Each structure stands twice: as structure tokens, then as C-alpha cells.
Write a protein that binds this ligand. Structure first.
Ligand SMILES: *[C@@H]1O[C@H](CO[C@@H]2O[C@@H](C)[C@@H](O)[C@@H](O)[C@@H]2O)[C@@H](O)[C@H](O)[C@H]1NC(C)=O
Ligand SMILES: *[C@@H]1O[C@H](CO)[C@@H](O)[C@H](O)[C@H]1NC(C)=O
Ligand SMILES: *[C@@H]1O[C@H](CO)[C@@H](O)[C@H](O)[C@H]1NC(C)=O
Length: 279
């Protein structure tokens, strides 16, 4: 069978100054929606304190680029507030609705021919953030991926991580023979760069916070610019790695042959870009 495309999108932070992590994740949702991925198969973890924040100059709107579209519109709210935590994130990956404690109960209850795309935005050596402690440590995330692999409930999985030291979540830990490929904004010893901040030329005067993260907006704007049936994960890896080489080293881990897949295997493609063949 062709299977179904599923995704987990998670912004691991809270607070209006962290606008960018929720904007990054809402942008990824818009790409999946335009690609034909269904809401029932997209699990969203976002604190939800940005859109109607008294500090937002545009209530109900979240943008991930100056003059960009409203990426908040229609985004599902599976886990918001303090329901974003290691217990719910790991149970959602595993697909066990009986292990969720608070939230909508939407989980990756996948079948062997399904594809999974996971995107996290919001890091330190060996761990990534949750809105409140405890943070998510490398071993606990990788052990959850090993449990998922042992169930055999997926064809292949692609995991994208936007965080400082992102590569430390997988380096020397992520198995290479279980059809899981991971791409990280930075390697184990590097920080990550924020972008679309106030001060840069032609920036809107209403904002006092950064609208995105450099690696995230580089791969997200690439997804928006091409027919994703003509671009592989490997082609995106090479393009984004070269594009932000001055800021961080884009790194890959796990089952590298999985990146031979076209991005559309995970994300679909927007018909508006059908003529935009990748070169
Ligand atoms: C799915 O999860 C069920 C419930 O797990 C129990 O409750 C959660 C909240 C944790 O406290 C966990 O440690 C408990 O065991 C399990 O009973 C069930 O076996 C799981 N199903 C599968 C197929 O793994
Ligand atoms: C708005 O953002 C501030 C950050 O200063 C946060 O403390 C507050 O809880 C947020 N409020 C709402 C209603 O989202
Ligand atoms: C991580 O990137 C730095 C450059 O920022 C490089 O010097 C270092 O060798 C890299 N580490 C690994 C394990 O590749």
C-alpha cells in the first residue's frame, strides 16, 4: 500500500519573546496542509500564547517572515500550554493514546506503510527544551525512537530539529538501520542562529521579536518554492547546508539512504508549484 503521511510538529518553548518557535511550526503546518496532508494525521504541540498575546501587534496573526502570510490560520491545537511535555510528546510518537495525560489524545497510531515527518523547533548539549522542566534528554528521545522501530508501525521517518547543539540529540545514538533519518540545524557543539529580527533593513516597525530561526526559514522557504515531487530530502540537505554554512553546520544522522526519498513522500506538494522543478 501507499500508506498515509503523518506528522508531529512541536515548538518546545513558551513566552512572547520565543514567537519564532511557534511561527516556525505553524509555517510547517501550512506546507503540509497545502501538500494534502490531513489534520487528523498532523499532531501539533504549540504553547499558543502568541496569536492573542496582548503584545502581538496583529492579534490572531503569526508570521514567519516580514510581510508574510498568516501561518497561524487553521493550525490544530492538539497539545497547548503545559500539556506540551515529555510524557505527551513521547506517547504521541509511540502512538499510545492510553499514555497521554492531558491534551487532545491525537497520537501517531500508524501502520507499516505510513510515512512520518517530525519537526521540533526551540537546545543545549544533550537535551532540547520543553516549556517547563524537565527538558527532553537525547537518550530518552532516542529510546522512544527505538521503541517505535521495534513496533514496525512505519515505512520510514524523517526528523528535523531546530535547536542549539541539535546534533547532540542523535550523534552516536540514532540507529542507522531502522528507516529513521534526522536532519539538525547545528552539530553537537554549535549554537543556532535566530533571524528576521528587528534592526535588519526593511523590517516591520511593529515587531520587537525575531520572526524565525535561520535553519528553519531556509528549509521552510525551500519547501514553499518547489514541486516537492522533484526534490529529495538529500537535495534539501545539501542546499540548506551550503546556504547557512556561515552560521552552523547542518548535520544528518541515522539511515542516510532514507534521504533518497522525494520531500513529497512526507510533505506532499502544493499544486501551485507544479512547474517549479528543482535544479
Ligand atoms: C499503552 O500504554 C498503556 C498505559 O501505560 C500506563 O500509563 C501511562 C500513563 C504510564 O504511567 C505507563 O508507564 C503505564 O504503563 C499500557 O498499559 C499499554 O501496555 C501500552 N500499550 C502498548 C501497546 O504498548
Ligand atoms: C503573553 O506573552 C507574555 C510574555 O511577556 C506572557 O507572559 C503571557 O503569559 C502571554 N499572555 C497570553 C494571554 O498569551
Ligand atoms: C561541529 O562544527 C564545528 C564547526 O562549527 C567543527 O569544528 C566540529 O568539528 C564539528 N563537530 C563534528 C563532530 O563534526
Amino acid at each position: 500500500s501507499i500508506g498515509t503521511r503523518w506528522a508531529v510538529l512541536i515548538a518546545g518553548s513558551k513566552g512572547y519573546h520565543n514567537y519564532r518557535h511557534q511561527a516556525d511550526v505553524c509555517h510547517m503546518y501550512q506546507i503540509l496542509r497545502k501538500g494534502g496532508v490531513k489534520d487528523e494525521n498532523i499532531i501539533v504541540f504549540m504553547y499558543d500564547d502568541i496569536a492573542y498575546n496582548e503584545s502581538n501587534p496583529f492579534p490572531g496573526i503569526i508570521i514567519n517572515k516580514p510581510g508574510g502570510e498568516n501561518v497561524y490560520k487553521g493550525v490544530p491545537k492538539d497539545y497547548t500550554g503545559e500539556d506540551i511535555n515529555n510524557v505527551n510528546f513521547l506517547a504521541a510518537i509511540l502512538g499510545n493514546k492510553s499514555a497521554i495525560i492531558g491534551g487532545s489524545g491525537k497520537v501517531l497510531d500508524t501502520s507499516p506503510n505510513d510515512h512520518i515527518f517530525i519537526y521540533y523547533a526551540x537546545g543545549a548539549p544533550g537535551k532540547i527544551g520543553m516549556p517547563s522542566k524537565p527538558y527532553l534528554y537525547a537518550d530518552d528521545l532516542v529510546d522512544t525512537l527505538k521503541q517505535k522501530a521495534a513496533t514496525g508501525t512505519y515505512k520510514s521517518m524523517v526528523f528535523y530539529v531546530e535547536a542549539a547543539n541539535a546534533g547532540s540529540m542523535f550523534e552516536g545514538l540514532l540507529p542507522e538501520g531502522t528507516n529513521i533519518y534526522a536532519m539538525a540545524a547545528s552539530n553537537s557543539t554549535e549554537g543556532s542562529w535566530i533571524t528576521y529580527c528587528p534592526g535588519t533593513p526593511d523590517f516591520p516597525p511593529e515587531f520587537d521579536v525575531c520572526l524565525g530561526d535561520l535553519w528553519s526559514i531556509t528549509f521552510l522557504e525551500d519547501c514553499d518554492a518547489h514541486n516537492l515531487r522533484t526534490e529529495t530530502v538529500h537535495q534539501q540537505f545539501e542546499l540548506v547546508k551550503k546556504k547557512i554554512a556561515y552560521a552552523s553546520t547542518v548535520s544528518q544522522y541515522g539511515d542516510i539512504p532514507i534521504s533518497k526519498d522525494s520531500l513529497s513522500v512526507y510533505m506532499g506538494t502544493d499544486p501551485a508549484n507544479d512547474n517549479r522543478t528543482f535544479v
